Amino acid sequence: NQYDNDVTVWSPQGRIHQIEYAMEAVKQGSATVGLKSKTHAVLVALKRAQSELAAHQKKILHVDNHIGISIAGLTADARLLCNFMRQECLDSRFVFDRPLPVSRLVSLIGSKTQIPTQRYGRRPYGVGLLIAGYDDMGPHIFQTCPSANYFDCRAMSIGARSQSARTYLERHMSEFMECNLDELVKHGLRALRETLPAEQDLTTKNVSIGIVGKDLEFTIYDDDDVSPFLDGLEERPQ
Template identity: 35%
Template sequence: MQQGQMAYDRAITVFSPDGRLFQVEYAREAVKKGSTALGIKFKDGVLLLSEKKVRSRLVEKNSMEKIQLVDDNVATVTSGLVADARVLIDFARVGAQQEKVTYGSLTNIENLVKKVADQMQQYTQFGGVRPYGVSIIFAGTDTIGPRLFDCDPAGTINEYKSVAIGAGKDAVTDYIEKEYRDDMALEDAVKLGIAALKSAVADSESMKEPEIASIKVGETFHIYTIEEVQKYLS
């Protein structure tokens, strides 16, 4: 820890002289220790992938779900503190239902992402709380088409063609920047995503059964079975 930093990282509401909020930066560090996950837009839909770290062979694999449905047309994948992710996903599910009751359908995913981002941003403004230690990728389809967003612990959101989070973010991003094409079909996107994950994940055990989900325009989210995933891995 740098000299003088201690005075500015005790509370979330205190800026350092160079304009930094250390607690937010620490939350981002927590995300960097999480599982690697990514989203990819293809020609007529969106794809989500995540490595699956099993800490012990005594853990039931079915209890570890990185990809979570918010709605039939919206799903998330997270990296960071699992408990924080669960709370925010529940918040997003309520927001999605409120949007449906108000407008009849989830017409714009960006509105939902902004609600979650606003919730995360509030926890960077008040004393006695800490930021959420999680980043979330939102993917789905709406009246605009396929959408892919990333939301970080500061509540910052951006829309992407492809985005990665977690421990292998930089390696995955470098790989996809070289290989990505706007006109990719679903099959090509899955192969690209798996190859990108493999380039970033050192532990081969966590890549034996990665989680994969996809959605095409006019359809609902499909979460791949173990058999479907193995077909691509082989």
């Protein structure tokens, strides 16, 4: 291949391989699940350890009081995008005193992520994000990719073995709109569980949860703060 070293080179098929190569980086990261009810937006992510001696990686990050993200792909590209999102949310509060609507923040990512895909010597962002937010229009779940494209979704999963989680949510997507918050998180956890191999299941050390909605600001529960959600578990079946 010679149509795959630069983002400014189109393939004869009508494609950009360097965008698609960056899209591979997302799939290699550990799975993360986003879903919403009429009142809440919930992020559930799988922490990963390189060895048992090392701690688990951070998957869910703070953006603003009303917006939170879960990452998949390169760490530095995720941290760079997180800081841009934070800066945009800060500028919005600094100028207008009101929180930046989720739709518009994602549009800014879509515009910013597009720039490097069209300039020589630059590269696409090696991260895909699941964005959970709450504004005047209620709860939102958004999806971004290495390609500047973004989607408004009822529920989504990205990362390794996210297809299994995707199918779970697709069956129960009509369920979510009338869901209680506790029932909504269990749905998110149950989809994330499908991604794991049969030998292993969700533990208090490897599960991260982010919640934002009408009731409260974006909160991250990690270790001891996570077990309330895991306890009350319908058993892993086949």
